[PDB]
Amino acid sequence: RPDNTAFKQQRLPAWQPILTAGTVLPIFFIIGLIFIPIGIGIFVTSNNIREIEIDYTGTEPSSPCNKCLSPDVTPCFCTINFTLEKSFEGNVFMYYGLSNFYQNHRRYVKSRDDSQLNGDSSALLNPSKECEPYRRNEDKPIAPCGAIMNSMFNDTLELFLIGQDSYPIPIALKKKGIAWWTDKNVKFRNPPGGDNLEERFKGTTKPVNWLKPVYMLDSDPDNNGFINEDFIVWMRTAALPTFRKLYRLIERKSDLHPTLPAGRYWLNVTYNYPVHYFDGRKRMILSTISWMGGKNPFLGIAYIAVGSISFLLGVVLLVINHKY
Amino acid sequence: TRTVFVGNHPVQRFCDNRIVSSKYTLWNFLPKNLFEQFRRIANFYFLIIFLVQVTVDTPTSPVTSGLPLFFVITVTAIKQGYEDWLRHRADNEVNKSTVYIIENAKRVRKESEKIKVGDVVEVQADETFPCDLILLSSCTTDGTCYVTTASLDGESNCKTHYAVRDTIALCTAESIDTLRAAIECEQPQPDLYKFVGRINIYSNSLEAVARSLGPENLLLKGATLKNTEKIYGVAVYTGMETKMALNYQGKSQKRSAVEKSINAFLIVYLFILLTKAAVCTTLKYVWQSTPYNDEPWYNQKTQKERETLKVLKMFTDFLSFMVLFNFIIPVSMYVTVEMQKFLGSFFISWDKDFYDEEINEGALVNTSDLNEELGQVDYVFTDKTGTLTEKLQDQAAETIEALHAAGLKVWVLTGDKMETAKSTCYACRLFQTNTELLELTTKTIEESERKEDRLHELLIEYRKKLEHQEYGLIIDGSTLSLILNSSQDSSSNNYKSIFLQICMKCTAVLCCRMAPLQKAQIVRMVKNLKGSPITLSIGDGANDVSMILESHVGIGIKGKEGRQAARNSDYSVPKFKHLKKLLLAHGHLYYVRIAHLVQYFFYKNLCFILPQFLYQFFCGFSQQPLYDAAYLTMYNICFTSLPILAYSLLEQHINIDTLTSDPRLYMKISGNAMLQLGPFLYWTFLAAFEGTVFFFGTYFLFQTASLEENGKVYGNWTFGTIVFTVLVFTVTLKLALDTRFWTWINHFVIWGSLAFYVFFSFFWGGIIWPFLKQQRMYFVFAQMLSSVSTWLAIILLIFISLFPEILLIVLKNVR
Numbered sequence A: 001r002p003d004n005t006a007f008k009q010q011r012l013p014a015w016q017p018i019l020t021a022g023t024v025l026p027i028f029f030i031i032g033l034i035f036i037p038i039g040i041g042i043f044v045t046s047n048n049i050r051e052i053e054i055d056y057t058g059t060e061p062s063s064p065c066n067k068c069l070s071p072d073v074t075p076c077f078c079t080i081n082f083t084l085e086k087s088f089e090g091n092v093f094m095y096y097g098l099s100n101f102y103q104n105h106r107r108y109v110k111s112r113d114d115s116q117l118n119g120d121s122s123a124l125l126n127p128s129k130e131c132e133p134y135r136r137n138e139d140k141p142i143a144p145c146g147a148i149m150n151s152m153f154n155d156t157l158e159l160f161l162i163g164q165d166s167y168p169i170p171i172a173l174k175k176k177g178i179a180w181w182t183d184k185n186v187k188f189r190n191p192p193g194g195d196n197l198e199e200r201f202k203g204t205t206k207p208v209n210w211l212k213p214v215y216m217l218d219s220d221p222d223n224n225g226f227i228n229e230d231f232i233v234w235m236r237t238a239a240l241p242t243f244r245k246l247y248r249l250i251e252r253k254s255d256l257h258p259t260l261p262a263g264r265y266w267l268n269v270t271y272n273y274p275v276h277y278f279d280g281r282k283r284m285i286l287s288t289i290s291w292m293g294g295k296n297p298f299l300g301i302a303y304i305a306v307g308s309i310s311f312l313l314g315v316v317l318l319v320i321n322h323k324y
Numbered sequence B: 001t002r003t004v005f006v007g008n009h010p011v012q013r014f015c016d017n018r019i020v021s022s023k024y025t026l027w028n029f030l031p032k033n034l035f036e037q038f039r040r041i042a043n044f045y046f047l048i049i050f051l052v053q054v055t056v057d058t059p060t061s062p063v064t065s066g067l068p069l070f071f072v073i074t075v076t077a078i079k080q081g082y083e084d085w086l087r088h089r090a091d092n093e094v095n096k097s098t099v100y101i102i103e104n105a106k107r108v109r110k111e112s113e114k115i116k117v118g119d120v121v122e123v124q125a126d127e128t129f130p131c132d133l134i135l136l137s138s139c140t141t142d143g144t145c146y147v148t149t150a151s152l153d154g155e156s157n158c159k160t161h162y163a164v165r166d167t168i169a170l171c172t173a174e175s176i177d178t179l180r181a182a183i184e185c186e187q188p189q190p191d192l193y194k195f196v197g198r199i200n201i202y203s204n205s206l207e208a209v210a211r212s213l214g215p216e217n218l219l220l221k222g223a224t225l226k227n228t229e230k231i232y233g234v235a236v237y238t239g240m241e242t243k244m245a246l247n248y249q250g251k252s253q254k255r256s257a258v259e260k261s262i263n264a265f266l267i268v269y270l271f272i273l274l275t276k277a278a279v280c281t282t283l284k285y286v287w288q289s290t291p292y293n294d295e296p297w298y299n300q301k302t303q304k305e306r307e308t309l310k311v312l313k314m315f316t317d318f319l320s321f322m323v324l325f326n327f328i329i330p331v332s333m334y335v336t337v338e339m340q341k342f343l344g345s346f347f348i349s350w351d352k353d354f355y356d357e358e359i360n361e362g363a364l365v366n367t368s369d370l371n372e373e374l375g376q377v378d379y380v381f382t383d384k385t386g387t388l389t390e391k392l393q394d395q396a397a398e399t400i401e402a403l404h405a406a407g408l409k410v411w412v413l414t415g416d417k418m419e420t421a422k423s424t425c426y427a428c429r430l431f432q433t434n435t436e437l438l439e440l441t442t443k444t445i446e447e448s449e450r451k452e453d454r455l456h457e458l459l460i461e462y463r464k465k466l467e468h469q470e471y472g473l474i475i476d477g478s479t480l481s482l483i484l485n486s487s488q489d490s491s492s493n494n495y496k497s498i499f500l501q502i503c504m505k506c507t508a509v510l511c512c513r514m515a516p517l518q519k520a521q522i523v524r525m526v527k528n529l530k531g532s533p534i535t536l537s538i539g540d541g542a543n544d545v546s547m548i549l550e551s552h553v554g555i556g557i558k559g560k561e562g563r564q565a566a567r568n569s570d571y572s573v574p575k576f577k578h579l580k581k582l583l584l585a586h587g588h589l590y591y592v593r594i595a596h597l598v599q600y601f602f603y604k605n606l607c608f609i610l611p612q613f614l615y616q617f618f619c620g621f622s623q624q625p626l627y628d629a630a631y632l633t634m635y636n637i638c639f640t641s642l643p644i645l646a647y648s649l650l651e652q653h654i655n656i657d658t659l660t661s662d663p664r665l666y667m668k669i670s671g672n673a674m675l676q677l678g679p680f681l682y683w684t685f686l687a688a689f690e691g692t693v694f695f696f697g698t699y700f701l702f703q704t705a706s707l708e709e710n711g712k713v714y715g716n717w718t719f720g721t722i723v724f725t726v727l728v729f730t731v732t733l734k735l736a737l738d739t740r741f742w743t744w745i746n747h748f749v750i751w752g753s754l755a756f757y758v759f760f761s762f763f764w765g766g767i768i769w770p771f772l773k774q775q776r777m778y779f780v781f782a783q784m785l786s787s788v789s790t791w792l793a794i795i796l797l798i799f800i801s802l803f804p805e806i807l808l809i810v811l812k813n814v815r
């Protein structure tokens, strides 16, 4: 009369796998033989990427920017010469890096209003509580609230190539397309009121550390406010005290000549950002990319180490179990 | 020395037949139950954590920490309240019964619970006595009555009692003629066979004849009257003082070895959490000593954080770190173990092996807190009449042989006489032909100090000098009474120890003519020696309830005697042969499932939290969570909760068909091996290794300056998502490797957890709702999966982490 159901009587059909050494031994070999070639390929790929970093912070009396460390009302300019040995053929991405800059601090990460940057009219006129003490200035709310927006990197970097003669030639840099497409076209929007951008920000004011208001960053209305590529790129946190952010893109010449021929170059910079107050460092990185990204041998080294440590262990166990 | 008058007419300070077996009342129940529950360290901690999270700060929400604690409190409170209301209802039946009292020359009827000492009472045929009576007369001559004590010694033999010679003639003819008598008695004792007293019956003018009172005159409570029309007795002991009510001892509480191991693990993890929080706060306040490391002109305090008291600040930061790292002790474990214990107990009732067509009933589970306790039994105490014999039962000898083959010691505790008790033992294969009977009965002790010589002879110069099967002890209740009570006269060699060693070094022990309380005394004496042996007692009679309520787990047979022991026990089987199936397979499976669930629950959260603690060294020790709040909330609720519950409800570690056919396999989990220091350290070190591997493998991966073919950088939420994905895949694949009995439910839950995690990540990341104050995770997961470098790194990490487990699996298959 009791229900003779397989579930109730604990008699559900099962697979019941029994893995043993004599059946899992080929796995230790196949994994090593599939992993070693991948490691070799990845490590070889990581060695054909050219990259150069130029530290231009100063803090040294033999550096050209020692005069840029402490100005008063003088807009400082530097110029650092450097040489390239092997030319760059692939695409070239301009980076700027900061050291000892804690972008992931708790009090600093949460100091933002993501709804206001989404174009919300209610949040446009009154910012969130979290972004303090950058919530109101001169009894007027700041349009971008928070330190994460207030302290944006604001240096101007220009590259100059010195030809056969002493006359330098400039290099064209494009500011479009350095931020994530999704967070540029969806997450960051503009206020919808009106067509002219200046009259959209009426009850708001520029940040304390700003020099021109947020609706005058660029002449093109597409990159004028809350859509500016540099602003959007800086709005993304770093996760580490030492980080790098994309700055410009150098495009391929139409003819098959390499994008950056080897030779001397000129780096005229505008020293506006103070970083020596907290023992920080500034640098500029020119690098090419590949199918995997930047230059890092860690992945290849780890794959080789894992493949070798698997294959050797498999061989050792194979020669040990041969006693039976 | 107490004096009672037969009719209360002179020629007090006693209770009033009121039996209470309960503990809670109908009002004080809530304050007492909450005080009893919140005294535990785990229940205090959870509260403290909930209050601190509500008061100071929380990373995700106070609800996720306040709701499961309330559910856990409520379930246990309901269980205890119901199990106490059942005892209230049972006591209501024993009280509020009908008895007939001759108060003033008339057959007054009162209620049973209103009996006062010193009134003559009348009981008809087949009526249970209401209290301790003293026989005054009987309907027939010779002053005799036939009383059977089916509820005191377990048998149904017709005993005989004798009335008072001076009072036999008084039969319904002026029995209340102000009968001048004074019953001078001894203070109540649980001996159940000794009674000293005297009567002071007077005459019409004056008399002083006094006849001594012995055990042949006491009419005990709870013994039915047989083959007599009507008798007349005088109550002397009424309620909480009768020899039946003295041998109860109540029920304190029962806890499992797994439950104690859970508390020990919680105590260890509490120290781990405190050390983590203290180290983090100390390093934080050392690092903030530099002027430019705090308020470095790019984020400054809102003046408040400056105006706050420094002394209060370290305490607040310590509470914040404790809240942040509190996840290493999961409330989910408690909420789950409750569901597992409630749901898994249904299999015992559902099993078709526990069915008897004669009784037309099945098994029964009274409590679900000892399912894991069924698989750790070490000693078995059995009752002779009713359980072993019905002649012997169907498989009484083979069940005992199987229990002996499993490494258990079977003792027979009965209330029958030695002559008939020893033959039954000789028929159950418990006493072989070539075994020397080591006997300590009353037949050889007719003094007092002969016992000390006998024990020394049979222990010090007979046995330990050496044959392990030959010697079997036989004892009597009378000798055991002196052994227990009179052991405090000499202290150089304790009687209890010198008797316990000879008991424990013997193959089997038989104890005859034993009171209901002495069984619980023997069980308690066994429970204390050399650590904590685990005891199980099985019986079918009302006299077995004292030893059923004292042992670790009590089994009650549904027999012809009654359901008195069936409702007071933890489980119930309508046979004795069912015990082999009940504890060989079901207990083993339950213990394995619960131990694996506990170990996995602790490991899964330690490995979850370790990367977050490691992350604080790379921020400013600012208590920045590595993962998103949604992931922190959803980790233990849906991503990893279901596979472990499905594993722990149905998983044949060894198939039951060969578990029942091989009793030898019970020894693999004899001493709580699965929850020992070895396995605990192995799981802890595995979690610590995997947690370090995750964080450092991703940290070395995040030094690229780019991971895409379009040259775009990643934030911190991508770092956290990478760590979380590697974490979830590793912790799911560990259990997938450990699984050994794959059903369609296991397939569904294990693969659906991963599929649901992926789909939930893709769904949460990609839609702006908007009802949140931030959109940090708008497209993090979808942007993270667009890089072959991250794909390859994740694939490499889910193998690097499991390499110790894969190597151990192989090494466990040779030598």
Ligand SMILES: CCCCCCCCCCCCCCCCCC(=O)OC[C@H](COP(=O)(O)OC[C@H](N)C(=O)O)OC(=O)CCCCCCCCCCCCCCCCC
Binding pocket: B049, B064, B065, B067, B068, B071, B075, B078, B079, B326, B327, B329, B330, B331, B332, B333, B335, B336, B338, B339, B342, B632, B633, B635, B636, B637, B638, B639, B641, B642, B748, B749, B752, B753, B756
């Ligand atoms: C009288 C006897 C009755 C005894 C039981 C009978 C039946 C009882 C049914 C009760 C059902 C559930 C009880 C409700 C209590 C839980 C309430 C609740 O939301 O708890 C929330 C908890 C959260 O804790 P945590 O994340 O571990 O961390 C806590 C830490 N202290 C902190 O700081 O925060 O999280 C948890 O405690 C987890 C919840 C339980 C886990 C099981 C849930 C699985 C369901 C899965 C959901 C969706 C599945 C989708 C995946 C697809 C896979 C196929």
Ligand SMILES: *[C@@H]1O[C@H](CO)[C@@H](O)[C@H](O)[C@H]1NC(C)=O
Binding pocket: A150, A151, A152, A154, A209, A210, A211, A272, A273, A274
């Ligand atoms: C650039 O930003 C820094 C950081 O706030 C500020 O001190 C400096 O004045 C800015 N330079 C401008 C606005 O020209």
Ligand SMILES: *[C@@H]1O[C@H](CO)[C@@H](O)[C@H](O)[C@H]1NC(C)=O
Binding pocket: A077, A078, A079, A268, A269
């Ligand atoms: C940048 O600095 C170089 C170095 O002298 C100078 O020749 C050039 O004119 C400068 N360009 C601008 C735009 O100031």
Ligand code: ALF
Binding pocket: B153, B154, B155, B383, B384, B385, B386, B413, B414, B415, B416, B539, B540, B541, B543, B544
């Ligand atoms: F039947 Al008994 F002790 F003799 F339970």
Ligand SMILES: [Mg+2]
Binding pocket: B150, B151, B152, B153, B154, B155, B540, B541, B542, B543, B561
């Ligand atoms: Mg009985």
